[PDB]
């Protein structure tokens, strides 16, 4: 009825879609399809149309003015201009007068031109027609967004625990280290639950290991945080060490587990240990195996992972280093001068994340070789599919908290994904604003962001208003790739209890959120559809049914400006430890918000639940709350033990009155 | 009593300002002094400080919360996270309770630490204590800088012709491409006045030729342009190539004008011609002989030109492509995997606009022997200072146009400045926007920028925007490193040239009165917190006010009005809205190929017809929007010459 499956070709197998839709033999009802150059999809806009979603992707909520390109890559710059980010999310809503949503079920290089080349032209293509086009009609956006995020699968949920607070850098190695961190914390009194493990605590950098020098006894060292609610949150990469005498490797040399070349030998690509096999996540038999080496972490102790890289990120492949070299000794050599700098720099960075790597190495996918090009968007997809259902195995009541870098439709089932890295800019915490919605809309709700940075190209003022918006956002941790070592820490400390207060609210909405597959962050235009002004909003967020959330982005700024559609009451966590209330009536406002204060505005006849700021998930007083909002509400607050699959009941539905 | 001057070591002399301030005896009144390490300037600000100044640099007009070195620099991207742009302005001013200005003349880098490391802190730092600190004292920051800019000079004027738009495509090689432009914009009746040249009309990039075989008679074909009223602005890059029987080569070679190596031979930098040498522009001889070049393009029929490269830009070294080539060498021997392909990548990046390079070669001042490095920042206004001082010897009563990319305080009074770097993003048209205040505190007055683009990623819409910015910048240029619709890109186009006689007024006021063509809204409407703060509009002249859209498929955008104001709106069809707006916040809705600006309480402006080259403008006859009763002092002069100081010059309009 209401979704229709148009094929092409032979497709693979993506496991998208949870829901088997048959394949609907009419002709294609949207647009001119031209199978004349590979494939491609050609829609013409009323200039009036609005383009939603590709979840993680460049730009606007409305996307139209610039074209994207679905191709799972790891640049660390994320300019205005970049066409390809960390996901691969193929779902956009056309909505106008004439309105549709499409998902494109492809696994490899999609190229969205929505008025790029021709500003009414819409321009789906691949190189390719071998490919599921879901089509989904609808009464509007909203509404069709409903029913992808039916099909697609619930969206994983996370451990109450990881709507705490979390903090981590990308050079902690020793027990010295993580100890300060808590000290830190704990004795200036600010909330955390979280502490982040990266690469520096494996043995060499190794895959299921831990350093045998700077912790001898790790197991001891987790109940040492645990006890202080200091969860450990070790990172996991794609790439396993090639190492003699290392069993995961051995495992997976022996067994026919490891990404082959052509002629059959394993595939080497070089990462942090250097030479690394990668796992063929695409062989369920193989997915098993990597996924059930979490065990040996688990069992000493960890609730939490995280994978990172998993592109996959090579630096080079053995082949890459070989060509290079070769050019530099040519180069060398000139003397006549025909091999100018700019090709010997160039050639430099052909050899990393090399489209011509990507066709150098084969998934064994159920007794087909398949050439990781043709199924590139797949890999950190299937790699987090691998963890979770191992998670399933090893100890089914719990939850675990995962989240992984590059992501596929389909993944949004066993982890989230953190928005990104690598600079400490102003445009992001605005360019991770917009892409939440979109996230939602293609099943990815736990998400947050990350602010790189060039040294400490992290000013004071950068971060808390980052934090800020990471209050609002389900994943929150301060990754330097700490509050304490800054000036002022009660505005710190303040940020972070205003996060604590919510933090009842804002799983409530996730929970219920994700187990009725509806959204935790809206565009204005889902909620006020018939407000032409609030439709193009781009910069405030409505969460849940509840409340909008307006972060300011600008640098220096004493508050910023809001459009209302209807009357709310603007509320600000202040750091005296109060709440301001203000009654604004529907329109254009400016709002007087400072670097300490956290903002948000309660909609007309509703209200949220604010608690005591506590220090950490546990220790939070979830029984007299203060009901914050309009005089007569009523809110359903959803609330469990926090720690395991047990959604169902009537226990955790609860209804508040004002 | 009102400017001191306080001198530190044996500091350089850079002929920044035009008057003479007395050497100070007494403390120094601010923050701290430190010759601990180096030299370093400490002041400790209240909270509601703004900091004012630093031309061309990065962020926002208020400068506080980030980090700045002066180190004339080229740097293809231009993210919030640099630190150096092109400009080494350091003029900077504390507008709180207490409020001062400070002009720190220094040459070589110069890092302003303005609350990055603490928030309170205003740390100003350098390496040889060798330097003169101008602190300017007034009581609005507005008059410190209307007093800076008596110091400092009067700005540079450009002919009238350059008040209207240029079109220009590095890659233009022959006669029929610039033939097309011509038609292309003369039959669609987009208006024009100037085609850019860029490096690819000269003889294998060789500085002051022309392509003999594109280009037989040259000056002819600028006369054939110059009768459709369209200008050639040729470009010049610092670099002279390195070629036996190159007349400029041969006599730079000869007696002594390039800069040398310690060693005592000529230093080679590799730029578009590959080996160049690079005139030695603090020599007071060279910059005679240099700038005399000139001559030969101005006696064709040229009458604007414009530096680049200027910084000045090296490739590489000849000392540096050995070394890479050495490395690289290894590189490719290398098995045990020691040298690894990123110190081989990173070693690549290095020998571009290298520091190593920056100290390999020397300058001759006046018989002294400075190493460039030292410097640095100076060359570029000295380079634009030859060709300028050169005019003057020419034709003291016609100006050129005349633009460059590096610049040092002081460069202001020959020429102007164009940023850009390249790619297209909507944060530049903010980010342009942001600049200029900043550079009009700083003597630059006429400044425009450019969609310098990564070449296909302009879309119309991000276009049409940058443009309608484009339209008030003193330098309205369209120069891409055809797209539908045309008749939008005339529209905006057009509403340029019935402002080109307000926006020329109001410029020339500014210029001759050493005032200011942009200015904050803090500036004007000093006690409103709320204005003190608006960074995203500006207040051109004293009766409008610009405040331009920068976000994509924005449909309008918010402002405040900080007083009443008319709300008007160039439209297509070509008519002008017009709507009364309060005191307050306001949204307002400005569709693609509309253009906007806001006219103040009790104010008017002139507004002509439609023209096509500014030649054809009617003045003699303009409407006047604004507010009925309300008066305009209008400037104009010839618009070629130097008769400023006339009072026939201005005539008062009553709306």
Redesign the interface.
């Known amino acids: 009825a209401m979704i229709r499956k148009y094929r092409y070709g032979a497709p693979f197998d993506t496991e998208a879609l949870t829901e088997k839709i048959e394949t609907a033999e009419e002709a294609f009802p949207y647009g001119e399809i031209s199978q004349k150059e590979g494939f491609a999809f050609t829609y013409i806009m009323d200039e009036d149309d609005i383009v939603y979603g590709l979840g993680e992707s460049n ?2 909520i ?1 996307k ?3 074209c994207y390109i679905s191709n799972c890559t790891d640049d660390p ?1 994320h ?3 970049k066409r390809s980010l960390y996901g691969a999310h193929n779902f956009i809503i056309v909505s106008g007068k004439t309105t549709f949503g499409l998902f494109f079920d492809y696994p490899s290089k999609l190229t969205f031109d929505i ?2 080349t ?2 009414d032209t819409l321009k789906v293509s691949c190189e390719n027609a071998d490919l599921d086009i879901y089509v989904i009609e609808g009464e509007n956006a909203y509404d069709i967004v409903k029913q992808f995020r039916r099909v697609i699968g619930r969206s994983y949920i996370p451990p109450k625990f990881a709507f705490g607070f979390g903090q981590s850098r990308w050079g902690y190695t020793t027990k010295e280290d993580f100890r300060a961190v808590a000290k830190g914390y704990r004795e200036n009194h600010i909330p955390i639950d979280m502490i982040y493990m990266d690469i520096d605590y494996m043995q060499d950098f190794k895959d299921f290991t831990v350093n045998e020098k700077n912790f001898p006894d790790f197991p001891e060292f987790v109940k040492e945080m645990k006890d202080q609610e200091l969860r450990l949150i070790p990172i996991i990469d794609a790439g396993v060490k090639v190492e003699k005498g290392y069993e995961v490797y051995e495992e997976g040399v022996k067994n026919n587990y490891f990404c082959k070349r052509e002629d059959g030998s394993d595939f080497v690509a070089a990462v942090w240990p ?1 030479d690394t096999h990668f796992p063929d996540m695409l062989n369920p038999e193989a997915r098993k195996w990597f996924g059930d080496k979490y065990r040996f972490l688990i069992d000493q102790g960890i609730e939490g992972f995280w994978n990172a890289m998993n592109e996959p990120a090579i ?2 492949s053995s082949e890459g ?1 070989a060509e ?3 050019f ?2 040519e ?4 003397t006549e001068g025909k091999i100018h ?1 700019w090709a ?2 160039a050639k ?2 052909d ?1 990393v994340n090399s489209p011509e790597d990507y066709k150098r190495f084969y998934h064994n996918v159920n007794g087909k070789k398949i050439r990781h090009d043709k199924v590139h968007n797949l890999f950190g997809y299937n790699m987090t599919r691998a963890a979770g259902e191992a998670f399933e195995r090893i100890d089914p009541e719990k939850r675990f908290l995962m989240f992984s870098r590059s992501s596929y439709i389909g993944m949004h089932r066993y982890g989230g994904i953190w928005m990104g890295d690598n ?5 992001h915490i605005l360019l991770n604003l917009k892409m939440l919605p979109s996230l939602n809309m293609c099943g990815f709700m736990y998400t947050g962001a990350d602010l790189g940075g ?1 040294g400490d ?1 992290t ?4 971060l808390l208003r980052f934090l800020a918006l990471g209050v609002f956002t389900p994943l929150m941790r301060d990754h330097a790739a700490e509050c304490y070592q800054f ?1 002022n820490i009660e505005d710190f400390r303040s940020v972070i209890n205003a996060r604590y207060r919510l933090v009842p609210y804002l799983y409530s909405e996730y929970m219920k959120a994700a187990l009725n597959d509806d959204m935790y962050f809206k565009p204005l235009g889902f909620v006020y559809p018939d407000d032409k ?1 609030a439709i ?1 909003v ?1 910069d405030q967020l409505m969460l849940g049914n509840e409340i909008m959330i307006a972060p300011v982005y ?5 508050g910023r ?1 809001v ?1 209302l559609p209807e009357e709310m009451k603007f509320i600000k966590f202040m750091p005296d430890g109060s709440i301001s209330e203000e009654v604004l009536e529907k329109g ?3 709002v007087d918000v400072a670097l300490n204060e956290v903002p948000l505005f309660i909609r007309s006849g509703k209200c949220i639940p604010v608690a005591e700021a506590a220090e950490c998930v546990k220790d939070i007083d979830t029984e007299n709350m203060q009901l914050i909002g309009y005089e007569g509400s009523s809110y359903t607050l959803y609330e469990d033990d926090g720690i395991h699959k047990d959604y169902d009941k009537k226990e955790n539905y609860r209804v508040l009155t004002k």
Not at 331 to 334: G, I, R, T, Y
Not at 554 to 558: S, W
């Open positions: 730009r606007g409305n139209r003015g610039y710059i300019t205005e201009d008025g790029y021709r500003m250097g630096f080079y280093l290079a070299k070769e530099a000794g180069f060398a050599k000139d700098p010997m720099q430099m960075k050899i600079k400490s800019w102003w445009s060039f190209d000013t004071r003022d950068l000036e002004m193009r781009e600008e640098q220096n700024a004493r400006y459009y254009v406002h400016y």
